[PDB]
C-alpha cells in the first residue's frame, strides 16, 4: 500500500461524499417528525460545605450545604485551589 495517490484520492472522495450529503439534507423540504451519561465526575462523588455564621443578637449557627452538581463543583474548587496558591 502507499499514501501518494491512495491518501489523496480517499480524502477527495470523502470530501465529495460529505458535500453531496450536506447539500441534500439542507435543501430537503421534507417535514421532520418531532447520548452517553457522565457520572457525577470521574471520582463519582459530590461536594459538601458545612459552615458557621453569627445571627442577630448572639448566636453561632452552622450550615452544611451539599452540592451534587459536578459543574458547580469544578468551578467552586478551581477558585479555592487558585486562592490557595494566590497567597
Amino acid at each position: 500500500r502507499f499514501s501518494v495517490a491512495e491518501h489523496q484520492e480517499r480524502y477527495k472522495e470523502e470530501c465529495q461524499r460529505i458535500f453531496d450529503l450536506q447539500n441534500k439534507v439542507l435543501s430537503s423540504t421534507e417535514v421532520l417528525s418531532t447520548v452517553t451519561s457522565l457520572n457525577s465526575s470521574a471520582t463519582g462523588r459530590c461536594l459538601k460545605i458545612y459552615r458557621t455564621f453569627r445571627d442577630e443578637e448572639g448566636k453561632e449557627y452552622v450550615r452544611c450545604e451539599t452540592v451534587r452538581k459536578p459543574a458547580v463543583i469544578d468551578a467552586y474548587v478551581r477558585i479555592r485551589t487558585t486562592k490557595d496558591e494566590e497567597f
Binding site: 459538601k48 460545605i49 459552615r51 458547580v72
Partner: protein, 145 residues
C-alpha cells in the same frame, strides 16, 4: 450613539396570520390600531392582540442563528441583525427545539452535536457568596446513601 436594532420573529395562529398578512400587504395605518404587542415583566410572556382579540404569547429561543440580510441590487447582501428569538402566539419551556425552515426540525435533538449549551456557573457564584458566610466547612466524597 447608534444602538443595534433588535429583530425577532412573530408567529401567529394561521387565521390570525392571514388577517395580519392581508393588513400588512394593504399598507394603511389601520393595521397599527389592529395589531398591538404587550410584553410582560416576566420577559418570556406576552399578549399579541390581533383586531383587539388577545392571544397568549411566549418568547422562545431558537436553536439556530438567523441573520437578516438587506440588498439594493440582489447581488450583494449586507447583514443587518441577528435573530434568535420568536414570539410564538396561540427555562426549558422557553427553548424551541425546531428551526424555522422545513429541513430543520428537531435540529436541537438530531442535527446538533451535544458538546453543551449552558446556569451551572451562576449557581457557582451563589455558592461562593454563601461560602463566604463560613469559618469551618466539612466536605466528604460520598457513596450510595
Amino acid at each position: 450613539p447608534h444602538e443595534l436594532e433588535s429583530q425577532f420573529i412573530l408567529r401567529l395562529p394561521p387565521e390570525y396570520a392571514s388577517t395580519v398578512r392581508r393588513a400588512v400587504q394593504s399598507g394603511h395605518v389601520n393595521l397599527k390600531d389592529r395589531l398591538t404587542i404587550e410584553l410582560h415583566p416576566d420577559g418570556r410572556h406576552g399578549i399579541v392582540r390581533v383586531d383587539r382579540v388577545p392571544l397568549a404569547s411566549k418568547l422562545v429561543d431558537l436553536p439556530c442563528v438567523m441573520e437578516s440580510l438587506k440588498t439594493i441590487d440582489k447581488k450583494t447582501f449586507y447583514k443587518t441583525a441577528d435573530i434568535c428569538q420568536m414570539l410564538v402566539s396561540t427555562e426549558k419551556k422557553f427553548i424551541w427545539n425546531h428551526g424555522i425552515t422545513l429541513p430543520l426540525k428537531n435540529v436541537r435533538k438530531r442535527r446538533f452535536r451535544k458538546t453543551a449549551k449552558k446556569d451551572v456557573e451562576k449557581e457557582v457564584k451563589r455558592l461562593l457568596s454563601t461560602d463566604a458566610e463560613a469559618v469551618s466547612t466539612r466536605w466528604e466524597i460520598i457513596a450510595e446513601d
